[PDB]
Amino acid sequence: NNKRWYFTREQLENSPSRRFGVDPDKELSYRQQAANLLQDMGQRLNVSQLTINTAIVYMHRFYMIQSFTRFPGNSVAPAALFLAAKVEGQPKKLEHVIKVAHTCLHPQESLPDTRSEAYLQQVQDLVILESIILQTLGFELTIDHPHTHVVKCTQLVRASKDLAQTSYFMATNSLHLTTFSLQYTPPVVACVCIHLACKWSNWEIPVSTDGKHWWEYVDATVTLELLDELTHELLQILEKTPNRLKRIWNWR
Amino acid sequence: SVECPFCDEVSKYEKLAKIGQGTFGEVFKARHRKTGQKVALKKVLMENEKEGFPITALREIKILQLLKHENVVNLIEICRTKAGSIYLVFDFCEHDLAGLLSNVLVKFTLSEIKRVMQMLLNGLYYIHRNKILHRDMKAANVLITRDGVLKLADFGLARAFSLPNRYTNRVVTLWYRPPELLLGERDYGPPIDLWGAGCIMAEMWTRSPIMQGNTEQHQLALISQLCGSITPEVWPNVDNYELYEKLELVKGQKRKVKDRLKAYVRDPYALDLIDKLLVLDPAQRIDSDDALNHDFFWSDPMPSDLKGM
Numbered sequence: 116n117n118k119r120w121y122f123t124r125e126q127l128e129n130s131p132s133r134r135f136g137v138d139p140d141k142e143l144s145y146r147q148q149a150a151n152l153l154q155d156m157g158q159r160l161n162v163s164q165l166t167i168n169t170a171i172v173y174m175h176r177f178y179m180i181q182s183f184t185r186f187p188g189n190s191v192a193p194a195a196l197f198l199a200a201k202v203e204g205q206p207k208k209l210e211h212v213i214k215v216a217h218t219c220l221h222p223q224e225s226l227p228d229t230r231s232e233a234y235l236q237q238v239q240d241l242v243i244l245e246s247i248i249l250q251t252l253g254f255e256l257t258i259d260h261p262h263t264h265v266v267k268c269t270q271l272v273r274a275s276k277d278l279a280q281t282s283y284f285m286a287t288n289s290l291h292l293t294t295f296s297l298q299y300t301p302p303v304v305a306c307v308c309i310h311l312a313c314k315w316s317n318w319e320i321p322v323s324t325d326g327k328h329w330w331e332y333v334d335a336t337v338t339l340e341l342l343d344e345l346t347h348e349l350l351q352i353l354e355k356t357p358n359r360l361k362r363i364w365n366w367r
Numbered sequence: 368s369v370e371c372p373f374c375d376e377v378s379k380y381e382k383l384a385k386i387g388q389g390t391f392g393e394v395f396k397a398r399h400r401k402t403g404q405k406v407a408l409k410k411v412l413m414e415n416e417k418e419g420f421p422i423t424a425l426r427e428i429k430i431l432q433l434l435k436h437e438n439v440v441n442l443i444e445i446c447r448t449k450a451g452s453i454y455l456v457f458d459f460c461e462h463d464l465a466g467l468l469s470n471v472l473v474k475f476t477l478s479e480i481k482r483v484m485q486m487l488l489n490g491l492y493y494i495h496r497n498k499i500l501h502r503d504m505k506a507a508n509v510l511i512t513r514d515g516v517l518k519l520a521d522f523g524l525a526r527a528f529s530l531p532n533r534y535t536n537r538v539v540t541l542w543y544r545p546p547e548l549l550l551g552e553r554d555y556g557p558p559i560d561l562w563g564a565g566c567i568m569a570e571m572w573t574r575s576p577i578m579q580g581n582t583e584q585h586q587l588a589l590i591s592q593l594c595g596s597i598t599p600e601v602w603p604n605v606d607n608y609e610l611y612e613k614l615e616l617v618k619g620q621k622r623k624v625k626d627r628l629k630a631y632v633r634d635p636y637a638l639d640l641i642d643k644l645l646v647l648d649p650a651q652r653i654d655s656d657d658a659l660n661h662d663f664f665w666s667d668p669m670p671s672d673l674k675g676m
């Protein structure tokens with residue numbers, strides 16, 4: 116369906132990982148870690164933030180079906196990134212992905228002889244995993260890219276370069292840090308990020324001459340009640356994340 | 368064993384017949400084991416794939432998932448095997464235009480030929496509107512269902528396009544390949560598919576591919592012997608292709624499109640439309656929108672439904 120990859124809060128609590136004894140808290144970590152690894156590998160592999168985001172969504176969704184107890188993020192991440200790069204038209208070679216993943220996970224360790232049996236195995240392992248990812252997602256790899264939605268919103272609100280830059284920051288961080296993508300459509304997430312960026316920069320969006328709020332021009336469903344609940348959730352996890360907020364903090 | 372809600376094993380289908388037997392490999396007709404629904408199965412071939420799941424298959428899948436239209440073949444689902452293999456599953460279509468056309472028993476009225484071209488051009492309008500180039504137009508890729516609905520098929524060479532573009536030049540079967548590509552173009556668009564529609568339209572009367580070259584040069588020669596010869600007068604800026612002179616095109620040739628096909632076709636409107644499809648300059652070549660609007664589809668006998676096949 117359209118609702119196939121969207122989950123109620125109740126459904127997120129009953130995740131495959133919870134079913135194997137993993138705390139809700141532990142699981143959010145496992146996700147944040149995977150998204151870190153994706154971000155790190157993706158930066159070294161020189162891929163776009165769009166490609167990394169795709170890989171993060173793949174990851175988020177993969178773990179609504181599979182458990183972290185059976186497939187560790189350090190195994191899935193590289194496979195997800197390999198796939199996302201192919202899908203987004205920035206293909207990276209299998210050997211190269213393997214190499215970069217190796218340095219990330221084991222900075223001190225030494226790369227295996229590419230002639231070895233141990234190495235041939237891990238090549239084969241990554242290919243196997245990509246295939247398990249493909250089938251888990253039932254081959255649905257076209258992702259709606261949320262950055263597009265953000266740019267559009269910041270135009271409607273005539274945001275400064277700064278406001279927009281902060282909105283994009285909120286956007287990228289929501290994927291690494293929250294399961295919003297599993298619960299809310301890209302356009303709604305965009306509103307949330309813009310809402311919070313305003314709140315943070317102390318910008319106020321003028322009530323239309325119609326007395327109608329902006330987000331209404333963006334998604335019918337969206338309400339101020341929902342936005343405050345979500346921006347709050349997003350802010351709290353930002354506050355937990357060392358140095359993240361410093362990047363958008365007005366230091367002057 | 369691993370959970371897998373969204374990818375069913377292909378054994379749900381029962382193989383009936385290796386219909387394709389093609390160098391393209393391999394299409395099976397099959398039957399849903401519970402409902403009897405007929406489908407076509409295509410295995411993703413992984414013979415020379417060192418880069419995991421073929422980027423080529425991802426592209427095709429992405430495209431079939433996007434394209435939903437009465438005149439475009441319908442991908443039902445993707446199936447696994449349970450080992451390991453992968454299969455694209457399509458709604459099955461009884462006929463294919465290449466087969467019908469080479470069958471001496473089969474006969475089209477002017478009215479039905481109109482209908483066929485209408486559906487085909489309508490499919491093209493749809494895929495192009497969705498930023499897709501088919502890149503493999505030919506009679507054999509045009510299917511027709513038991514109920515007379517035409518479907519464009521085989522998106523394995525298709526690709527999205529946009530907005531200076533550097534697309535792959537060696538696309539499209541030689542006989543259906545437009546001048547642009549043969550002259551080395553990499554910044555081409557929807558007009559390449561329409562050139563193909565032209566060759567197919569003509570084929571609805573000639574019952575055989577009009578221009579059967581053996582090499583690119585032979586192909587380019589054949590095209591010149593039909594459409595006149597490639598001239599910066601006829602095709603503004605054609606000279607700036609590297610191969611234009613560097614490929615000794617002919618010089619006396621003049622347009623014989625209507626004369627050489629005059630025999631088979633007869634109907635003035637049909638000849639006029641074919642002439643506007645087989646235009647040399649891609650930018651002067653008629654598009655699906657205007658083609659659909661052409662008087663050919665709006666004069667008697669008006670287009671009719673498909674029957675006796």
Ligand SMILES: C/N=c1\[nH]c(C)c(-c2nc(Nc3ccc(C)c(S(=O)(=O)N4CCOCC4)c3)ncc2C#N)s1
Binds near residue numbers: 459462465466521
């Ligand atoms: C690119 N080739 C194809 N792949 C699929 C899935 C095709 C298809 N075929 C049918 N029915 C059907 C019936 C008769 C024939 C002859 C054929 S054929 O494609 O194998 N043919 C044409 C080329 O030369 C040999 C014969 C197909 N239905 C649905 C699909 C799809 N998709 S074609």
